[PDB]
Design an enzyme around this catalytic site. Sequence first.
Site, PDB file in Angstrom:
ATOM      1  N   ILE A 229       0.851  -1.178   0.000  1.00 24.31           N
ATOM      2  CA  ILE A 229       0.000   0.000   0.000  1.00 24.31           C
ATOM      3  C   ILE A 229       0.885   1.225   0.000  1.00 24.31           C
ATOM      4  O   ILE A 229       1.539   1.508   0.989  1.00 24.31           O
ATOM      5  CB  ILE A 229      -0.941   0.070   1.197  1.00 24.31           C
ATOM      6  CG1 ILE A 229      -1.980  -1.033   1.202  1.00 24.31           C
ATOM      7  CG2 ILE A 229      -1.963   1.183   1.009  1.00 24.31           C
ATOM      8  CD1 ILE A 229      -1.655  -2.492   1.137  1.00 24.31           C
TER       9      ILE A 229
ATOM     10  N   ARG B 290       4.469   6.645  -4.446  1.00 25.31           N
ATOM     11  CA  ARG B 290       5.244   6.996  -3.286  1.00 25.31           C
ATOM     12  C   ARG B 290       5.500   5.782  -2.411  1.00 25.31           C
ATOM     13  O   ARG B 290       4.907   5.622  -1.330  1.00 25.31           O
ATOM     14  CB  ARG B 290       4.552   8.133  -2.535  1.00 25.31           C
ATOM     15  CG  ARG B 290       5.442   8.882  -1.552  1.00 25.31           C
ATOM     16  CD  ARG B 290       5.226   8.338  -0.173  1.00 25.31           C
ATOM     17  NE  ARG B 290       5.708   9.207   0.869  1.00 25.31           N
ATOM     18  CZ  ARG B 290       5.477   8.959   2.138  1.00 25.31           C
ATOM     19  NH1 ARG B 290       4.742   7.911   2.487  1.00 25.31           N
ATOM     20  NH2 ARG B 290       5.967   9.750   3.071  1.00 25.31           N
TER      21      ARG B 290
ATOM     22  N   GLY C 149       8.786  -3.576  -1.077  1.00 23.99           N
ATOM     23  CA  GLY C 149       8.930  -4.592  -2.108  1.00 23.99           C
ATOM     24  C   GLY C 149       8.845  -3.972  -3.486  1.00 23.99           C
ATOM     25  O   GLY C 149       9.694  -4.233  -4.334  1.00 23.99           O
TER      26      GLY C 149
ATOM     27  N   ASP D 243       0.376  13.299   7.267  1.00 18.10           N
ATOM     28  CA  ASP D 243       0.894  11.966   7.520  1.00 18.10           C
ATOM     29  C   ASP D 243       0.334  11.421   8.837  1.00 18.10           C
ATOM     30  O   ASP D 243      -0.248  12.174   9.671  1.00 18.10           O
ATOM     31  CB  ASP D 243       2.419  12.062   7.664  1.00 18.10           C
ATOM     32  CG  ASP D 243       3.133  10.787   7.300  1.00 18.10           C
ATOM     33  OD1 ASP D 243       2.450   9.814   6.877  1.00 18.10           O
ATOM     34  OD2 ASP D 243       4.394  10.777   7.415  1.00 18.10           O
TER      35      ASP D 243
ATOM     36  N   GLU E 118       2.194 -12.112  -0.806  1.00 16.16           N
ATOM     37  CA  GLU E 118       1.157 -11.722   0.119  1.00 16.16           C
ATOM     38  C   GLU E 118      -0.184 -12.384  -0.273  1.00 16.16           C
ATOM     39  O   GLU E 118      -1.057 -12.557   0.564  1.00 16.16           O
ATOM     40  CB  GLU E 118       1.112 -10.186   0.199  1.00 16.16           C
ATOM     41  CG  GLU E 118       2.083  -9.586   1.223  1.00 16.16           C
ATOM     42  CD  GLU E 118       3.387  -8.975   0.676  1.00 16.16           C
ATOM     43  OE1 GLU E 118       4.063  -9.511  -0.219  1.00 16.16           O
ATOM     44  OE2 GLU E 118       3.801  -7.929   1.207  1.00 16.16           O
TER      45      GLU E 118
HETATM   46  C1  4LU Z   1      -2.743   0.601   5.607  1.00 17.16           C
HETATM   47  C2  4LU Z   1      -1.854   1.647   4.955  1.00 17.16           C
HETATM   48  C3  4LU Z   1      -0.476   1.398   4.926  1.00 17.16           C
HETATM   49  C4  4LU Z   1       0.443   2.303   4.319  1.00 17.16           C
HETATM   50  C5  4LU Z   1      -0.069   3.504   3.790  1.00 17.16           C
HETATM   51  C6  4LU Z   1      -1.464   3.781   3.819  1.00 17.16           C
HETATM   52  C7  4LU Z   1      -2.358   2.846   4.419  1.00 17.16           C
HETATM   53  C8  4LU Z   1      -3.854   3.064   4.472  1.00 17.16           C
HETATM   54  C9  4LU Z   1      -1.837   5.143   3.222  1.00 17.16           C
HETATM   55  C10 4LU Z   1      -1.931   5.167   1.713  1.00 17.16           C
HETATM   56  C11 4LU Z   1      -3.064   5.703   3.890  1.00 17.16           C
HETATM   57  C12 4LU Z   1      -0.797   6.199   3.628  1.00 17.16           C
HETATM   58  C13 4LU Z   1       0.683   5.813   3.663  1.00 17.16           C
HETATM   59  N1  4LU Z   1       0.792   4.453   3.130  1.00 17.16           N
HETATM   60  C14 4LU Z   1       2.103   4.013   2.787  1.00 17.16           C
HETATM   61  C15 4LU Z   1       2.637   2.834   3.327  1.00 17.16           C
HETATM   62  N2  4LU Z   1       3.902   2.464   2.971  1.00 17.16           N
HETATM   63  C16 4LU Z   1       4.619   3.211   2.076  1.00 17.16           C
HETATM   64  O1  4LU Z   1       5.891   2.858   1.693  1.00 17.16           O
HETATM   65  N3  4LU Z   1       4.097   4.325   1.526  1.00 17.16           N
HETATM   66  C17 4LU Z   1       2.863   4.735   1.851  1.00 17.16           C
HETATM   67  O2  4LU Z   1       2.441   5.776   1.299  1.00 17.16           O
HETATM   68  N4  4LU Z   1       1.879   2.112   4.307  1.00 17.16           N
HETATM   69  C18 4LU Z   1       2.438   0.831   4.818  1.00 17.16           C
HETATM   70  C19 4LU Z   1       2.589  -0.300   3.815  1.00 17.16           C
HETATM   71  O3  4LU Z   1       1.609  -0.259   2.764  1.00 17.16           O
HETATM   72  C20 4LU Z   1       2.481  -1.659   4.533  1.00 17.16           C
HETATM   73  O4  4LU Z   1       3.259  -1.727   5.740  1.00 17.16           O
HETATM   74  C21 4LU Z   1       2.899  -2.820   3.632  1.00 17.16           C
HETATM   75  O5  4LU Z   1       3.007  -3.968   4.476  1.00 17.16           O
HETATM   76  C22 4LU Z   1       4.216  -2.605   2.873  1.00 17.16           C
HETATM   77  O6  4LU Z   1       4.363  -3.635   1.896  1.00 17.16           O
HETATM   78  P1  4LU Z   1       5.683  -4.556   1.744  1.00 17.16           P
HETATM   79  O7  4LU Z   1       5.981  -5.114   3.116  1.00 17.16           O
HETATM   80  O8  4LU Z   1       5.091  -5.581   0.807  1.00 17.16           O
HETATM   81  O9  4LU Z   1       6.782  -3.627   1.231  1.00 17.16           O
HETATM   82 MN    MN Z   2       5.473  -8.396   0.433  1.00 20.58          MN
HETATM   83 NA    NA Z   3       3.384  -6.343   2.499  1.00 22.72          NA
END
Ligand code: 4LU
Ligand code: MN
Ligand code: NA
Lengths: 469, 459
Positions: free
Chosen positions: B146, B160, B166, B258, B209
């Site tokens: 996400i 972003r 990943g 944020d 996932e």
């Molecule tokens: C639930 C959620 C998790 C966000 C998130 C949001 C939400 C709603 C948003 C969209 C509201 C605002 C910020 N988001 C980001 C984010 N990670 C990231 O690198 N950039 C982001 O912009 N995170 C965390 C990230 O998506 C999770 O920790 C995943 O596990 C990362 O995936 P990966 O381990 O497969 O790399």
């Molecule tokens: Mn993953």
């Molecule tokens: Na993940």
Amino acid sequence: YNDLRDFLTLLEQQGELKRITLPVDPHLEITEIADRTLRAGGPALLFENPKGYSMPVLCNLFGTPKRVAMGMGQEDVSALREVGKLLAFLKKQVLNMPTKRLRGAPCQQKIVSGDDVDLNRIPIMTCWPEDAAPLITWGLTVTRGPHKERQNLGIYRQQLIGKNKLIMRWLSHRGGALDYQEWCAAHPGERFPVSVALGADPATILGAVTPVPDTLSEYAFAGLLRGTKTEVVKCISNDLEVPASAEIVLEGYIEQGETAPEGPYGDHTGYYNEVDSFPVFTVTHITQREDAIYHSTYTGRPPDEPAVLGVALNEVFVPILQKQFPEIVDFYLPPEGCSYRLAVVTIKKQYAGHAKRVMMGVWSFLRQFMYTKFVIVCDDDVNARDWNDVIWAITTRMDPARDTVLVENTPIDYLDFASPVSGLGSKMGLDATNKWPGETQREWGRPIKKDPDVVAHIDAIWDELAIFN
Amino acid sequence: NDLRDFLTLLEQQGELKRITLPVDPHLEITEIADRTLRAGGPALLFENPKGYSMPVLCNLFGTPKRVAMGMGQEDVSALREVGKLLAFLKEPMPTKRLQQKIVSGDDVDLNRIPIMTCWPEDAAPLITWGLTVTRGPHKERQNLGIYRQQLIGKNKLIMRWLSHRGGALDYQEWCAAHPGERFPVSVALGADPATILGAVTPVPDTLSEYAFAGLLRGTKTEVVKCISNDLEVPASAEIVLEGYIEQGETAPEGPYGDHTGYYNEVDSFPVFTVTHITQREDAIYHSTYTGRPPDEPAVLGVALNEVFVPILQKQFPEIVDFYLPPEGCSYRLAVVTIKKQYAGHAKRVMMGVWSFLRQFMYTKFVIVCDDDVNARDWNDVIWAITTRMDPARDTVLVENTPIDYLDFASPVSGLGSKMGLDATNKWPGETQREWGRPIKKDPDVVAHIDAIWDELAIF
Ligand SMILES: Cc1cc2c3c(c1C)C(C)(C)CC=[N+]3c1c([nH]c(=O)[nH]c1=O)N2C[C@H](O)[C@H](O)[C@H](O)COP(=O)(O)O
Ligand SMILES: [Mn+2]
Ligand code: NA
Ligand SMILES: Cc1cc2c3c(c1C)C(C)(C)CC=[N+]3c1c([nH]c(=O)[nH]c1=O)N2C[C@H](O)[C@H](O)[C@H](O)COP(=O)(O)O
Ligand SMILES: [Mn+2]
Ligand code: NA
């Protein structure tokens, strides 16, 4: 099936065993010779002519890590990493690998019992000048508890206190001491059978000192290192089994309540520990080979043979650490640091501050390193095992006050007298990694890398150069 | 099965509310959802978003119960069992490939979607619940993450992803292994809840996932090949965006509010060019927001900590409870309770929090207490701090440790200190004083009062 004598012939063929024909005293002089030898990374030693005895003394068997590897059948010490991964999985049915019991064995060729038992005929060494008495140091002590079949093997030092009396110095968390403690509760006033084997085959010896579970027999692990079942023989005076290839075996019992003041003895920290009471082991039988060889060692200021053993057996944990911290390239606890008190770790650094996470991992992940008071962290261009690399890193990549971590009031070994309070002390981590932007505002140094083409050309003409031739 | 089944389940239980009043995706939905979440209310479906025909679903996971429900379970306590499953990862479930009907080409217009603007000084509308799907060039595994995505054109989003994600690693390797070639990417909006929760559960980078979501569900994740690439997206998705990242193309991103409650300053990230938009006939747009905690992400983070407690306990069986309050921006402070077994024990535990798992590498305050303290009640924790610490003796400070690069409070980007507070009872060695015996109630007196309490009729 390699017994110990086969191993010694293998070592001699490779210039790793030296026979001394000069008269040498088991009182103090052998230790001195072995100490110099080990500190110069020399061979194992067989003193064929010990002053005042007829039985040869073998020592410094495992004074080199190579010889630990050879004793497990291998070329090099890394095979122990595979054992690392195996031990991970148990927390493999045909690791329920029993002993093969022979009827009759060379270790029972000559037998002596009751009033004929004289431990003074054995060239038991006195290691250090203020040690209380001669000390047996390479005995595999075999015991059973009253509640399971499992036979524990431990190495517990044994002070000579009579013709047929040893002190049995097992600390209270050892298998032998737990077995005894249970026997006393479960069979009040009855003698506790025990047997000690001297000079077993190398896989058995190395197995005894590996930290396997209390649930499992150390005989079973030696079978895995060997590739074949450990060959044993029933003792004469009890139902315990000892290695068939043993050079000498002591059989007897501990009389409940009977204890003696033990030591002082010099130990692996390089200090004398003070006097203390331990159970007495009464020896009713001594069995041995024709031509029996007495296997011994000593512990003192590191490095000594125990320390070198400890270093080879730590290889077991590297894989377990690496699973958790894949950035770790090597992890080494030098013998000269009493085997656990200092660790050098090398990493592939991936972000500012990384060294600190690694330090905290050493101090928290596994219990064996909870009490480790110095941790040095370096990059992967450093050989953790060469003080020339590690001191180079420390002296070119640290600003002492910026890069040193101290933490106070942490768990420390109760017997470490150097801490302010028993059980409690500080720890130091040295971050000797290259500093990245954020960690420093200076332009960091670019190390001198050799031209591989120049190196290769010089390899080619090196013999022709003939500088020695 | 899919998201719509989950919404009908929630509606039956009074956990989904439909809004028919006109409500603006610009600012107003965030305000409504924020009040709703702070009072622990239902999930919200805005059926009449001002200026769009597609309904907006938000606050789906605003309650920990609803996170549990989304994993098929009754209760938030069931999440520990999911944690033991996640543990089983020592050493020595694929997707079912089959909907969404309508499709666009160069009639791609993201302005037709009710993308939300969350806070008054945010740069632009922002997509916040996209499951971004990627492959790297070196393995088959599909990562789902996400990452927030700023609207910058009819067919352009900013991607972003922070550099340890990943998606960002996959992209970085693709550039380098295939210089100058477009990086295929697809984003799914409104997948089934097991897929969504699987995306945000930190499984290994080695594992898809999609596989974990199958374990939470009990059945394989049903997926469909994308139209314009070989990536697979959830068959039940409400909307899917397909396209690519053109190598080298970047845009200034933000500012955006944020999860800390502050704005991130402007920064450059890759541009995602959108070539296709696929969707269901009555498509629903799933969205959220981050801001001052608590928000939906924070609530997700609290439920997922329950998953980690068992994993920590396996390593450190002295740990009784481990809690990261939402008010600490979800990861920045942890409270740990232990059954203390030896002088100095608290320090080992602090170092374990700071080294064992990566989710807590950046946690800058750790408070350690005994097991008579409820970690989740500031009345107990403050009591322990104020009756069991001498500040200077019992505080551990460590400098020049890894810190989140966006944490403006640290002296240098990426680098900062951490504090551990040892609030355990001090054992001999740790103190030379006679320690205090706490007041314990007589259980016979308590029981008698329970019995006569109604008859007493005090309230
Ligand atoms: C639930 C959620 C998790 C966000 C998130 C949001 C939400 C709603 C948003 C969209 C509201 C605002 C910020 N988001 C980001 C984010 N990670 C990231 O690198 N950039 C982001 O912009 N995170 C965390 C990230 O998506 C999770 O920790 C995943 O596990 C990362 O995936 P990966 O381990 O497969 O790399
Ligand atoms: Mn993953
Ligand atoms: Na993940
Ligand atoms: C190799 C080796 C290990 C010694 C040892 C020695 C050697 C040569 C001596 C005999 C030279 C002097 C110090 N020894 C003692 C000792 N453990 C102990 O409780 N008392 C000891 O005196 N250790 C360690 C102990 O034997 C190992 O930790 C075993 O694995 C214990 O097995 P267990 O865990 O099954 O009891
Ligand atoms: Mn044992
Ligand atoms: Na042992």
